[PDB]
Enzyme design. Structure first.
Site, PDB file in Angstrom:
ATOM      1  N   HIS A  39      54.546   8.762   2.580  1.00  0.00           N
ATOM      2  CA  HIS A  39      55.655   9.355   1.834  1.00  0.00           C
ATOM      3  C   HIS A  39      55.314  10.688   1.180  1.00  0.00           C
ATOM      4  O   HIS A  39      56.144  11.268   0.469  1.00  0.00           O
ATOM      5  CB  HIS A  39      56.218   8.354   0.813  1.00  0.00           C
ATOM      6  N   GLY A 141      51.670   9.957  -9.533  1.00  0.00           N
ATOM      7  CA  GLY A 141      50.571  10.701  -8.978  1.00  0.00           C
ATOM      8  C   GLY A 141      49.433   9.849  -8.471  1.00  0.00           C
ATOM      9  O   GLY A 141      48.502  10.390  -7.866  1.00  0.00           O
ATOM     10  N   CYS A 143      49.486   7.439  -6.129  1.00  0.00           N
ATOM     11  CA  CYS A 143      49.525   6.970  -4.757  1.00  0.00           C
ATOM     12  C   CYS A 143      48.366   7.516  -3.943  1.00  0.00           C
ATOM     13  O   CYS A 143      47.866   8.633  -4.166  1.00  0.00           O
ATOM     14  CB  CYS A 143      50.827   7.348  -4.094  1.00  0.00           C
TER      15      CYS A 143
END
Ligand SMILES: *[C@@H](O)[C@H](C[C@@H]1CCNC1=O)NC(=O)[C@H](CC(C)C)NC(=O)O[C@@H](C)C1CCC(F)(F)CC1
Ligand SMILES: *[C@H](O)[C@H](C[C@@H]1CCNC1=O)NC(=O)[C@H](CC(C)C)NC(=O)O[C@@H](C)C1CCC(F)(F)CC1
Lengths: 298, 296
Positions: A39, A141, A143
């Site tokens: 993503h 932030g 991920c």
């Protein structure tokens, strides 16, 4: 008994940041590939129900900004494998440890190196719940932060972070991009299954209590595995598998208490409560220490 | 509980052996720091005269290994309870660092090591009685505790011993013990421990931020009246600096510090009623306000 994480340095040496546009998250640099959540290729307009295949068609190698610190790593190829992006880069990471990608079972524990902008902030020990969520500390932030175990010299990567659920728990994938649990990487509200207690870890905790001399709960009876499983489910405990019985082998050998006798002891604690007593200085039965964690620490 | 990433410290750990005694050392630039009782035998550890034991040692009685490679010791000195071994090689992995002596109530990360190899990392608090509730086994001495700010590692603790109660004691990196302890193989008791009040409050704020707020009330208290109750229950006094340090958390939640003090007072007086807070049947006191903010 403390929640003890693995030393994080071998994983610290693999963390990078990956940016598309203004979307930045973390990636994992091993040899000449960087692994990260797919993503990163999303705007806002996309995150509601991204068409990942069409979003990636519009991307070229030169759209990905990969940085180790502030030093850019040139991307020379890209591909998508389930929910992870693999970015081939032109430099092999000199800090690559010996490593494996593994898919863990619920109940297993691992260390998380929480990272922001490719910079590690902290390390902590997590358990995969039976409903395939973890109780991380994960902020915006985070991920692409990973979960891992270390055995001898070898890092087994088992988790990459992708999302937060309405209840505040966390969900993610293995390093092949396959989610743990029924979750998808879309900015939609998703419910986890009702959670249950990790029976094999409670038994590990009772063995640890015995090892330390705290053994009032031991009885002279036994049970079958099937009878135990049927009772345990009525108390929102997970049923045991054959693999659970086997991973309790070392603690059973250390204490001389057969696994099924300990199950009979736990069954009595479930049916009668603690009668105001404690185990290892606690009124609660702990379920986030695995049989390995007990050994690794004792 | 979240620890600092341990890599900068892992790159400094080595193994130190004298005789049959082996423990860990910290290799910074061309010096290795380690507990002085590495020079003791079994017989020695019972009542050691360290200055006497040390003058009977030469550089070559010290075996320092960084992985497979032996480092040659070219000098040695003792500073309080720490031995400083000068080696002929500088550690290229030496981080920016400082040596600090921490205050009781403050937290740090511990990198537990055996035979010079890192084993695990966890967060500890310096107790008011100057013990730490660690997980240390035989061979863990010389393991260090530290905090990291920006790129700078602040070393605050080196591990030396276990007490009969199972808690742990050690020194700063100048070799001075925290607490009234001595590096001799004798059973030692600590002073009465107290609970770190400012940390309990910080953790109650963390519980509210995560939506767990059954324990709140509409009572209030003055600072002095709270402190009278706290002392009765063997909680540390709360200072005005502590109240100021809790400001940000108070702002975030909109719960005035003294209102959270009133909540804590009722928990002390009534107990938790078999309820839990953040999953704990006990009030947790090893998270500082800074720890809570960093993670919330
Ligand atoms: C590191 O060398 C080691 C770490 C100890 C071992 C077990 N857990 C620990 O934290 N330090 C020592 O063994 C230390 C050496 C002395 C010269 C200071 N002694 C020590 O810690 O003794 C403890 C294990 C005993 C416990 C039983 C007792 F009766 F209370 C006396 C102290
Ligand atoms: C990646 O850094 C980020 C990590 C999130 C942010 C805050 N805590 C986390 O664990 N992940 C996402 O932003 C993720 C992106 C999608 C494309 C999968 N979405 C997400 O996790 O949104 C969460 C914060 C909301 C929470 C409320 C909700 F109703 F459940 C919808 C999703």
């Amino acid at each position: 008994f403390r929640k003890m994480a693995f030393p994080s340095g071998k994983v610290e040496g693999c963390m990078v940041q990956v940016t598309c546009g203004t979307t930045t998250l973390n990636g994992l640099w091993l040899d000449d590939v960087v692994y990260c959540p797919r993503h990163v290729i999303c705007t806002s307009e996309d995150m509601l129900n991204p068409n990942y295949e069409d979003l990636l068609i519009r991307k070229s190698n030169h759209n990905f900004l990969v940085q180790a610190g502030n030093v850019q790593l040139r991307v020379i190829g890209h591909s998508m494998q389930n929910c992870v992006l693999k970015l081939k880069v032109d430099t092999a990471n000199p800090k690559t440890p010996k490593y494996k990608f593994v898919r863990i079972q619920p109940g297993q524990t691992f260390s998380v190196l929480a990272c922001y902008n490719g910079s590690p902030s902290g390390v902590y020990q997590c358990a995969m719940r039976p409903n395939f969520t973890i109780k991380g500390s994960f902020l915006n932030g985070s991920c692409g932060s990973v979960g891992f175990n270390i055995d001898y010299d070898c890092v087994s990567f088992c988790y990459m972070h992708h999302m937060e659920l309405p209840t505040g728990v966390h969900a993610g994938t293995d390093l092949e991009g396959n989610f743990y649990g029924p979750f998808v990487d879309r900015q939609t509200a998703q419910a986890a299954g009702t959670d249950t207690t990790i029976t094999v870890n409670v038994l590990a905790w009772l063995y640890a209590a015995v090892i330390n001399g705290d053994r009032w709960f031991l009885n002279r009876f036994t049970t079958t595995l099937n009878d135990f499983n049927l009772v345990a489910m009525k108390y929102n405990y997970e049923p045991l598998t054959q693999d659970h019985v086997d991973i309790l082998g070392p603690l059973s050998a250390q204490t001389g208490i057969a696994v099924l006798d300990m199950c009979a002891s736990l069954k009595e604690l479930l049916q009668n409560g603690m009668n105001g007593r404690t185990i290892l200085g606690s009124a609660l039965l702990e379920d986030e220490f695995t049989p390995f964690d007990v050994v690794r620490q004792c």
